[PDB]
Structure formats: C-alpha cells, structure tokens
C-alpha cells in the first residue's frame, strides 16, 4: 500500500485521486488516506502529490510511521473520494510546515 503522510494535512490538493486506477482514497476534512487493502501499489499517485506526501509503506520516514496505521484506520470511517476538487484555501501556506498531525480533523 501507499501511505499519505503529514504534509497532506491542511493542503489536501487531491491531485492524487485522478490517477488512482482503483479509487482507494477516502476523504477527511483536511486530509486524505489510502485504503491499504484496496491499493494495488501501482505507484502512480506518488509523483502527482504537490505536497510530496505519498510514500510506499516500506519507504515511510521513521518519524512518520504512525501514518501507516492512521491510513488503515481512517480509511474505514471516511467517505470514498473519486474526483479531484480544489485545494484547501491556504494549502500553500501550510505546504512544508512540519508537525501538522496536531491539526488533523476527524
């Protein structure tokens, strides 16, 4: 599975979903997650993220390992998203800020 990590929070550009062949992204208020059972590891979304927030799970940074289980858990509760929409309004101010998990909204 590919995993969405920290920099997606408060950016949520959603470019990643246009390229997903199996529609396995699920939508929260200010973050997206990949459903690990659905992902076919095609790696097509990883170059599309402007925030460079998607990683193969075997390449998730050490300080972002929490995101693996978070994607698995929230994917089970959030609605499926299959079409790109506009980025959050201040996405570029928050792109690159570290430690945005304290801002995640359920």
Catalog residues that contact ligand SF4 under the rule CB under 6 A. Answer: 2, 19-22, 24, 34, 39-45
Q: Which of 47, 3, 43, 6 minimizes the C-alpha distance to 25?
A: 3
| Distance separating alpha carbons of residues 49 and 41, to the nearest angstrom | 15
Regarding 74 and contact with ligand F3S (CB under 6 A), the answer is no
What's the distance, CA 18 to chain centroid? 13
Which of ligand SF4, ligand F3S, none does 32 bind, CB closer than 5 to 8 A by kind? ligand F3S
Per-position DSSP letters for 63-89, written without gaps between them: GGTHHHHHHHHHHTTSPB--S--PPPT
State which of residues 1, 16, 24, 60 lies at the interface with ligand F3S (CB under 6 A): 16
Query: What dihedral do alpha carbons 35, 40, 41, 42 form, nearest 10°?
Result: -130
The annotation status of 42 as a binding-site residue, yes or no, is yes
Q: Which stretch binds ligand F3S (CB under 6 A): 42-50, 59-67, 70-78, 96-104?
A: 42-50
State which of residues 1, 10, 13, 74 lies at the interface with ligand F3S (CB under 6 A): 13
Which parts are annotated binding residues for [4Fe-4S] cluster? 20, 39, 42, 45
Binding residues: 8, 16, 20, 39, 42, 45, 49
């Amino acid at each position: 599975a590919f995993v969405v990590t920290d920099n997606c929070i408060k950016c949520k550009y959603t470019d990643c979903v246009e390229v997903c062949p199996v529609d396995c992204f699920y939508e929260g208020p200010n973050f997206l997650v990949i459903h690990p059972d659905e992902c076919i590891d095609c790696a097509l979304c990883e170059p599309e993220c402007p925030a460079q927030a998607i990683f193969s799970e075997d390449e998730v940074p050490e300080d972002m390992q929490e995101f693996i289980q978070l994607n698995a858990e929230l994917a089970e509760v959030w609605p499926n998203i299959t079409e790109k929409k506009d980025p959050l309004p201040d996405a570029e101010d928050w792109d690159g800020v570290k430690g945005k998990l304290q801002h995640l909204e359920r």
